[PDB]
Amino acid sequence: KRQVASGRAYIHASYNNTIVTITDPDGNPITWSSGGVIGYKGSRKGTPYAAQLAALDAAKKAMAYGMQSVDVIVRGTGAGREQAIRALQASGLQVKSIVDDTPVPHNGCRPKKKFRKAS
């Protein structure tokens, strides 16, 4: 199993679960983690702690492949967010850059009625 020196950490925040995946410089997944992938299950997978834990754990698995540095790419809003970033930063595993990249339609499909409470 190859040694990667650097690459991407993708953080996908949501109001229900934070998930983090780590890839080589062409975006191919090395490792990944999520709230559920640590112990939490149901409504705790969102909590900034859950996010932190997942985040840290993914980084440890990548450091196994000898990963030394990353560009972070964050997507979505949710509680675990700054906390998963704060984690990667403090996991040793060096944080080269950060970048929000949340998808947004330039007015695309009709959202589900829950999401037009702003009707």
Binding site: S97, I98, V99, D100, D101, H106
Partner: protein
Amino acid sequence: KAKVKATLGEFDLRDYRNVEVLKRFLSETGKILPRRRTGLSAKEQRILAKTIKRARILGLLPFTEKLVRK
């Protein structure tokens, strides 16, 4: 700080090619900057939105970018 018109000298803002100028009227997310920041008049601001949109189709200015450091 500055309004983007306070910066420049005179320019044709019907000119959908001059990316050197037109590029300054976009945010770092490549979004068309509001009047309050462009320092433009309602009328000019209208004309520009048009020229900017024409550039985008030729490939010269962006529809979007991503926020760096968040």
